[model samples]
Target: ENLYFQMKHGRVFIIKSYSEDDIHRSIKYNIWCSTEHGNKRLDAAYRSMNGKGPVYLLFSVNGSGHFCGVAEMKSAVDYNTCAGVWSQDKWKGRFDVRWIFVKDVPNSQLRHIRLENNENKPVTNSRDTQEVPLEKAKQVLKIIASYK
Candidate 1:
């Protein structure tokens, strides 16, 4: 079996449907974090991957609540609030981060990758984030690069 890797912080993988539009806007501006609360996973993954030799794998779900695609945390996760919703108390302790879309794989493509054989599945019931095997990670990277 091949070793797999994921973000040490699982919540980072939890890109809520409500925040998708905001996230897309942030990405357009090269920003990463969303205006959502309890973004500890984003913080942890950023801390762990920053300046590290290898890029980190971050997954997201679509509005329909299905696994979308994978991206690389190209920048450090920083602190920010949702411009759409703001409250002195509500936005008090929020964080933000940025990522680069490398590969957009469908559920079918997941089967070819090694994710504890739990590919094509949602992380709702399982571990949220983890590290994928270096080789597999590289494969995804290659796929991402191919798009260019």
Candidate 2:
């Protein structure tokens, strides 16, 4: 429902709602893109989320993984990671990833916020991601401020 674009040639796409059947597929897609392509890794893990279920932080880069971003999981833990277990099993690894994004970002917002914050914040708390004409900045600001 809320969508924007990144100034760097790509558009910011957000999905406000999803179907039950698509949850697993969405998680798998986000994980694969992050780990394999986006170069992301599991940063931190939280337990027992709200209606969205569990949560996970997927980083965009390697090393420490903190330098990367975050992705929240919406599925249930059918595995052993939450229990602090670390053995190979046939479970979903204690996570059900529902939505995936570069933490509170859309590619464009991530870039601008990166410049505005200069890695101090790295990612922005706003949902507007795409860069726009200078005039649009005012609109963006208004939209961003609404969240506050």
Candidate 3:
């Protein structure tokens, strides 16, 4: 998904996902924004899955070095526990985030970001693990850019 947003300052914000190859394979796990501050990061608040199924994000770090990690969906959780952010209420489901504050620095670049199952583990109701390639992440960024 692609999102484009126009800030109060009259700027056309764009979020583009990048990957080794392919674009449609990307997932809506990570989000990016363009602003006068350059690029600001924002993460989605995890929402409970309502005991439906599992969700996950696949992403790799690039810059000084390269690394990949998986983010799993929560059944039901307290905000402070997983996020460490102070909040009055708990949230369910998946919380998407841009992960900007968690980035390395000014030169930190996201080579690829994708979504996947909570783990390689198989679920009873699920068919197979959904894998979002890095190339597909770029396509997701567009969805974020289109946000009002």
C-alpha lDDT of all candidate models, in order = 0.44, 0.30, 0.27
When 2 and 3 are scored with lDDT, the better candidate is 2
- TM-score result, candidate 2: 0.26
| TM-score to true structure, per model | 0.49, 0.26, 0.23
Writing each residue's lDDT as its tens digit, candidate 1 over 1-148 gives: 4334323332124343344554555455544443333345555656675555434445544433334344445554445544434212333233434455623445443345554445634333224444454545555545444442
Q: What is residue 64's positional error in candidate 2, in angstroms?
A: 14
Runs in model 1 deviating more than 4 A are: 1-20, 34-38, 57-59, 63-71, 74-99, 102-104, 117-131
Candidate 2: C-alpha lDDT: 0.30
Candidate 1, which ten residues in sequence have the lowest lDDT sum? 3-12
**How close to the true structure is residue 61 of candidate 1, measured as C-alpha lDDT?**
42
True-structure Cα RMSD, model 3 = 17.5
Residue lDDT tens for model 3, 48-107: 233343333333322223223333333332223332121212222223333322221111
Superposed model 2: Cα runs more than 4 Å off: 1-49, 52-59, 63-72, 76-92, 99-109, 114-119, 124-148
Score residue 104 of candidate 1 by CA lDDT: 47
Candidate achieving higher TM-score, 2 or 3: 2
